[PDB]
Amino acid sequence: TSVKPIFSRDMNEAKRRVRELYRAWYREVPNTVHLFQLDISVKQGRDKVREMFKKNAHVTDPRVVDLLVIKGKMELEETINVWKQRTHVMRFFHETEAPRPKDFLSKFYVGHDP
Amino acid sequence: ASATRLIQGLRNWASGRDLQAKLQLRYQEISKRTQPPPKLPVGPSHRLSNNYYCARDGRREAMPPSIVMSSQSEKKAVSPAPPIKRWELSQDEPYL
Amino acid sequence: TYKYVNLREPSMDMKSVTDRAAQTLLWTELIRGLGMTLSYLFREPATINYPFEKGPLSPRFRGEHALRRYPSGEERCIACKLCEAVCPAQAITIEAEPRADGSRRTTRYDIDMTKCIYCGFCQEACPVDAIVEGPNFEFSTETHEELLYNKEKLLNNGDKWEAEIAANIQADYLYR
Amino acid sequence: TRPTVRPRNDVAHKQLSAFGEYVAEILPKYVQQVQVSCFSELEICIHPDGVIPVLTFLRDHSNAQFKSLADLTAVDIPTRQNRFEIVYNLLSLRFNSRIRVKTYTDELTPVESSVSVYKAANWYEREIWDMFGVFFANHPDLRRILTDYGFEGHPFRKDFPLSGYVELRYDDEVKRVVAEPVELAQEFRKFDLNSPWEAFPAYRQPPE
Amino acid sequence: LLKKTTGLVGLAVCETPHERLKILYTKILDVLGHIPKNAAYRKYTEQITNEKLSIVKAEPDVKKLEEQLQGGQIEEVILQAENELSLARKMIQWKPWEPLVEEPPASQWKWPI
Amino acid sequence: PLTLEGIKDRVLYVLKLYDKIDPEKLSVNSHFMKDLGLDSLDQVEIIMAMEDEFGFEIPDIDAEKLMCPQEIVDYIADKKDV
Numbered sequence: 176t177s178v179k180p181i182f183s184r185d186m187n188e189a190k191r192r193v194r195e196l197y198r199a200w201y202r203e204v205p206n207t208v209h210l211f212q213l214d215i216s217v218k219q220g221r222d223k224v225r226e227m228f229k230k231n232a233h234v235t236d237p238r239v240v241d242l243l244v245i246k247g248k249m250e251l252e253e254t255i256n257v258w259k260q261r262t263h264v265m266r267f268f269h270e271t272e273a274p275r276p277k278d279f280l281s282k283f284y285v286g287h288d289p
Numbered sequence: 290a291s292a293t294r295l296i297q298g299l300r301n302w303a304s305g306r307d308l309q310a311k312l313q314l315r316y317q318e319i320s321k322r323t324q325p326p327p328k329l330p331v332g333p334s335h336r337l338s339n340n341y342y343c344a345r346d347g348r349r350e351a352m353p354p355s356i357v358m359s360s361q362s363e364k365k366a367v368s369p370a371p372p373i374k375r376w377e378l379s380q381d382e383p384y385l
Numbered sequence: 386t387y388k389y390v391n392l393r394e395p396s397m398d399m400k401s402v403t404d405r406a407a408q409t410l411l412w413t414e415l416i417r418g419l420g421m422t423l424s425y426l427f428r429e430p431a432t433i434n435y436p437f438e439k440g441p442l443s444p445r446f447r448g449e450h451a452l453r454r455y456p457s458g459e460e461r462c463i464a465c466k467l468c469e470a471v472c473p474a475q476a477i478t479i480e481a482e483p484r485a486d487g488s489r490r491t492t493r494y495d496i497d498m499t500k501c502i503y504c505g506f507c508q509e510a511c512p513v514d515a516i517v518e519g520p521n522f523e524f525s526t527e528t529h530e531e532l533l534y535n536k537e538k539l540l541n542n543g544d545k546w547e548a549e550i551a552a553n554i555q556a557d558y559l560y561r
Numbered sequence: 562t563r564p565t566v567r568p569r570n571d572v573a574h575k576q577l578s579a580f581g582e583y584v585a586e587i588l589p590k591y592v593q594q595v596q597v598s599c600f601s602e603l604e605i606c607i608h609p610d611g612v613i614p615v616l617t618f619l620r621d622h623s624n625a626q627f628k629s630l631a632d633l634t635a636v637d638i639p640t641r642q643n644r645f646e647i648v649y650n651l652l653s654l655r656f657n658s659r660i661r662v663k664t665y666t667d668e669l670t671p672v673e674s675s676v677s678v679y680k681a682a683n684w685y686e687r688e689i690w691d692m693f694g695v696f697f698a699n700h701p702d703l704r705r706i707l708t709d710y711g712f713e714g715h716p717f718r719k720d721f722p723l724s725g726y727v728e729l730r731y732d733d734e735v736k737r738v739v740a741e742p743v744e745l746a747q748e749f750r751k752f753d754l755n756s757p758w759e760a761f762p763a764y765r766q767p768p769e
Numbered sequence: 770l771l772k773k774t775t776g777l778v779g780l781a782v783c784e785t786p787h788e789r790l791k792i793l794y795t796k797i798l799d800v801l802g803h804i805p806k807n808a809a810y811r812k813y814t815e816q817i818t819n820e821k822l823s824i825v826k827a828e829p830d831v832k833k834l835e836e837q838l839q840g841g842q843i844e845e846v847i848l849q850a851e852n853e854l855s856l857a858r859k860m861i862q863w864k865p866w867e868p869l870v871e872e873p874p875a876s877q878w879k880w881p882i
Numbered sequence: 883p884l885t886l887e888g889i890k891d892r893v894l895y896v897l898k899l900y901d902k903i904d905p906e907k908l909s910v911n912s913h914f915m916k917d918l919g920l921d922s923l924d925q926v927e928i929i930m931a932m933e934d935e936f937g938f939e940i941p942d943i944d945a946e947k948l949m950c951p952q953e954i955v956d957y958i959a960d961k962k963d964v
């Protein structure tokens with residue numbers, strides 16, 4: 176059952192890495208909003224950051240969350256430098272996407288999808 | 290090829306070469322666009338006897354790779370091949 | 386087996402030195418390049434007068450697709466679906482049913498000219514020479530939807546270009 | 562079997578078998594398998610922990626001198642528990658030879674990077690990380706190299722569909738290029754072309 | 770002979786190839802003396818290095834030394850000696866003559882699946 | 883920054899500036915996870931507000947043990963002269 180670690184031996188250092196990545200994203204959100212001339216406020220960007228971290232918050236494997244921290248670090252570096260355009264930053268906010276119905280009755284009305 | 294002799298002479302002087310010997314514009318020297326019909330030959334397997342497919346099946350002679358070592362004396366050291374031979378300089382145009 | 390490009394040592398006698406210095410001061414090779422471009426000015430240009438003159442082509446040329454017929458009016462396609470099976474871009478859609486006299490004929494034959502890569506696999510996978518790639522290439526359209534051919538469009542293309550497609554096939558069929 | 566069958570090389574087969582024995586005997590700590598194919602190609606399957614020592618030996622030994630790294634690839638085989646097979650192709654100009662070094666890893670185990678041996682491995686395993694999600698430890702600068710800047714998922718894996726999950730279109734309301742769930746006007750038609758009859762009896766697997 | 774240029778860019782011409790090669794081969798032998806005797810790497814590299822050292826010591830001229838060493842120029846032979854010394858030190862550090870670290874799974878190298 | 887009363891007032895003021903937490907239940911000895919029901923990330927951005935307003939950074943070793951405002955006041959009193 177012994178496996179080779181990536182960066183974190185157990186869950187505590189993995190949680191520290193998650194904490195540091197969240198701090199870096201929270202610091203960069205105002206500069207990302209200003210430099211890209213986004214139509215959102217700083218609060219909406221920070222709520223999106225917190226929403227992504229909360230969506231990804233049911234994992235207990237140290238290697239999986241190490242890979243998640245690594246991919247978040249790549250995204251943060253991708254945004255700090257101007258490599259993403261405005262479309263890549265705004266792709267987190269699905270503005271043009273139609274609201275998907277959630278209850279049973281509307282899904283029954285619109286199609287066969289469960 | 291329709292150029293005058295004076296223009297040909299000036300062209301050859303300024304170019305430094307005889308341009309009329311090797312013209313880049315094609316003329317009636319090329320092959321015609323309508324050709325007589327061909328008759329292509331047949332291959333070596335177009336025979337009526339001694340032509341069994343089991344005697345010339347290339348794909349069926351392919352074998353699985355031979356396992357040399359598996360984990361399930363004073364022998365000489367071995368290179369992957371004899372060492373490559375040194376290249377010889379070109380006799381035609383060595384640029385030397 | 387190999388040769389030494391750019392391994393010529395420069396001579397250091399006074400003749401070669403003065404030749405190189407005169408070439409530096411008087412710009413000899415620049416005059417050489419100028420003179421040869423001047424010589425290239427006085428040649429007949431290789432430009433043809435399109436659309437009044439067309440570039441040369443071959444009977445193997447792959448242009449617009451067409452559906453052919455037997456020399457009795459009957460169409461050649463018998464709905465064997467080999468062309469849509471061999472199509473590397475999946476540009477062909479075929480649907481078939483037996484028609485009134487029981488013949489095996491297509492009811493739908495679509496070729497997406499925006500998916501097709503003009504590779505000619507369909508005209509060489511056809512056992513009856515039904516689908517062909519005709520010699521026409523000037524069929525640019527102003528709309529995307531005009532490039533989605535159905536069976537009627539391909540049959541019209543065949544009826545339009547039969548007098549050339551049959552001659553090209555007659556010229557080339559001995560090489561196949 | 563003269564005209565239409567590929568002629569067989571046996572001197573090269575003998576030499577490659579001898580060199581495979583040589584390598585597998587010099588490095589027993591990492592080498593797990595050595596095989597030579599029908600068309601005289603030598604494959605050395607090793608443990609993932611010995612990627613650096615085996616490659617450094619093959620690069621620096623006087624009897625190996627495999628100075629060129631031609632290609633670095635990963636292959637996705639989902640039925641294995643270590644589904645990713647990492648393949649190094651090496652070329653030796655001194656002896657005019659080629660070798661293949663294979664190792665394995667799964668999704669969560671990192672592999673030691675071979676930038677410190679061969680410098681082409683930088684971009685090659687950056688591409689491998691981009692397409693298969695295989696992490697390479699001790700890399701100088703590991704990011705994506707071919708996919709889109711906001712792309713999620715590794716496309717060369719075999720559970721990733723051919724057409725992706727999103728598609729791009731220009732929206733005039735937001736005056737921007739936007740990504741939407743994928744919808745195809747014509748679905749990609751799947752063809753079942755496998756013959757139900759056995760083709761090559763020499764590759765027959767034993768029954769359970 | 771005093772070759773002006775070895776032919777390869779960045780490879781400087783060696784003025785005294787014999788002393789350099791002898792020093793490098795003896796250094797390789799002293800480094801390899803630390804590896805255990807039963808290790809096949811030590812036996813093979815000792816054999817090939819002793820052959821190369823005898824060939825170098827038995828030939829005063831360089832052109833016939835280059836011809837019978839079968840390694841191209843003498844400077845790339847010196848380069849290969851340096852690379853072999855570096856590999857010998859790294860192989861002292863790694864110790865790859867030990868038994869196999871771990872067996873693969875049952876169908877790790879089975880193709881086709 | 884020089885007096886403990888001013889330190890406590892600045893800490894408590896910028897804690898009242900935090901939007902999602904009521905000022906009524908906030909005292910000097912209120913926990914974060916079980917008193918106001920703040921998340922881990924809530925405490926994280928509270929600590930980043932601490933560094934943003936007090937002008938000195940806080941590492942992740944010692945930011946994990948700041949659950950009530952008295953602990954924050956005592957820590958930043960340790961890091962300063964006071």
Ligand code: SF4
Nearest residue numbers: 472501502504505507
């Ligand atoms: S030319 Fe090739 S790509 Fe085009 S329809 Fe024929 S088979 Fe398909």
Ligand code: SF4
Nearest residue numbers: 462463465466468511
């Ligand atoms: S290959 Fe020829 S006969 Fe067969 S379906 Fe296509 S066009 Fe028709």
